[PDB]
Amino acid sequence: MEDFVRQCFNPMIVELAEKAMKEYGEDPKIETNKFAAICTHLEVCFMYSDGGSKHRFEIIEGRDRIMAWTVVNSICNTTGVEKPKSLPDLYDYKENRFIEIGVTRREVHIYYLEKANKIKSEKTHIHIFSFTGEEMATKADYTLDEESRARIKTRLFTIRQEMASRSLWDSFRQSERA
Ligand SMILES: O=C(NCCc1ccccc1)c1nc([C@@H]2CCCN2C(=O)c2c(Cl)cccc2Cl)[nH]c(=O)c1O
Ligand SMILES: [Mn+2]
Ligand SMILES: [Mn+2]
Ligand code: NA
């Protein structure tokens, strides 16, 4: 599974994921499912931001903390939107709202509720993907067109199939905690 991650994901994603783990004292060579999950969430955030017109989205996830908040605080100043209590994943210039992206190994509704309680910043929009093709979004508003969302869902499915072909999927699927 460590070799799986290093083979499956772009090196920039893998480096960001290793850093995120190390900043909390975790070893990517040991907590390997966590390693994969963080890689997956990052790649989904980058694909989402490529999903619309050029310049439609601002990426917040994947930046160091100081630059992430500089982006958020900048956007709050130029558009007047409310400042979130915690770092979101993207800003949508078209809809003028922050977006929290979730990727789940359980199912989308339990995760949606959890991030609704976890974030609770009433203004941030929540969009969840599963590995089996379900999605769930705030007020049933899915932001991107069907083509873009289809591309994300197809990519998660491929990862699932690839894990299972290597016999890693069952441990990964069971490793996500409330
Ligand atoms: O922005 C995120 N994290 C910002 C920093 C942060 C760090 C801890 C708690 C809150 C926020 C973020 N995080 C997660 C999930 C759930 C919370 C932790 N986590 C991780 O991926 C994760 C990371 Cl980052 C580092 C080490 C281990 C893990 Cl398990 N899911 C998201 O969808 C997401 O957007
Ligand atoms: Mn995030
Ligand atoms: Mn997220
Ligand atoms: Na979060």
Author numbering: 1 to 53, 73 to 197
Publication passage describing the model:
The influenza virus RdRp is a heterotrimer that includes the polymerase catalytic subunit (PB1), the ‘cap-binding’ subunit (PB2), and the endonuclease-containing (PA) subunit. The ‘cap-binding’ and endonuclease functionalities of RdRp work in concert to perform the essential ‘cap snatching’ of host mRNAs to generate primers for viral transcription. The essential endonuclease domain within the PA subunit is a particularly attractive drug target. The chemical scaffold for our studies is 4,5-dihydroxypyrimidine-6-carboxamide (DHPC), which was originally developed by Summa and coworkers (Merck, Italy) into the first-in-class HIV two-metal integrase inhibitor raltegravir (Isentriss)30.
An important feature in the discovery of new antivirals is the ability to show potency in the face of resistance mutations. Thus, our approach starts with endonucleases that incorporate single point mutation or two point mutations so that we can identify inhibitors that can retain significant activity even when these two known resistant mutations are combined in the influenza viral endonuclease construct.
